[PDB]
Amino acid sequence: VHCTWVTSNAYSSPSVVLASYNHDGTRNILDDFREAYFWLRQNTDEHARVMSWWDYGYQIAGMANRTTLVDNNTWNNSHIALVGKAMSSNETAAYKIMRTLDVDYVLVIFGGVIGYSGDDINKFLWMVRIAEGEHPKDIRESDYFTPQGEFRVDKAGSPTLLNCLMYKMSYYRFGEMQLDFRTPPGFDRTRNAEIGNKDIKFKHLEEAFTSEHWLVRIYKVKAPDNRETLDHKPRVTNIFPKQKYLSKKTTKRKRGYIKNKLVF
Amino acid sequence: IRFESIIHEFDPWFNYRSTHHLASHGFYEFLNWFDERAWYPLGRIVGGTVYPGLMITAGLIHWILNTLNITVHIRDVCVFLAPTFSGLTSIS
């Protein structure tokens, strides 16, 4: 009787389809893994390269049938170190790392809307440690902790993590996603703490797909900058008054202004 | 009985994928198989960096079962390979 109970309640559970049980005994199936992987299978190029943590390396190549960079079987640890450094830096260094590997998409599992334990924020510290193992001069573990010495997502978190790429990648446009149940506007059901950076914007990425319960998020690595721009506003001195002009334009009156125009 | 007759954990997907290759290309193609769709800039020599015991058994049972005109898909063989072998484990 014990063996039958243990097999029924404990070890017979798939990790592909998640089952959330209603109160009346009805079971709902969160099927977001296969949804995102099937999109990735039928809405990308045939030779697209996805970047993911090593855990799902197999599952993408089996389900989604796309070229992964780092697999589940680990036989080259500096490749995983490169992927970890890309997943735990700001957008500029991570974008250089992603350009030198010819990556196209970036896949991150975010389990914050529903109460899913293992997402990539819960597996972020191992990324930091693996990337520290091979690049001690660039990534410091202690840098992603608060000056008290703990790992948190609030306003008290470190500004070295609040601009990381995993953080900016798995929390994009989440500071406006408020559940119908009365709770703060931004709230993480796993890390029961209100996010500190409500508004984040990308510079080299763009959102490509986001599953129904926001479980799996796929971003697209854009092309390089079309042209370089000045870092500063053009030169303005105080010798002559600027006298900036006012817009003077409606949806009906579309007529511009010229200083040196002969009047009638 | 619940959900669906599909594969579950992270590891069995690679076993499945290489077994599918062994079904659609034979044995001497799986022994020389140079997967370029994994570890992208490097490529993974699958035939020479894997243990071909699960794949060969699944492919052999698939071939025997399809020679007798019992048309079973190879994902069903990969799903139901383990209980059948549990019986043999009891005998052993």
Binding site: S15, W53, W54, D55, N72, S117, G118, D119, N122, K123, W126 | E9, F10, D11
Partner: peptide, 7 residues
């Protein structure tokens, strides 16, 4: 008990 990172 799988081949994932310990969360």
């Amino acid at each position: 008990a799988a081949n994932a990172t310990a969360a």
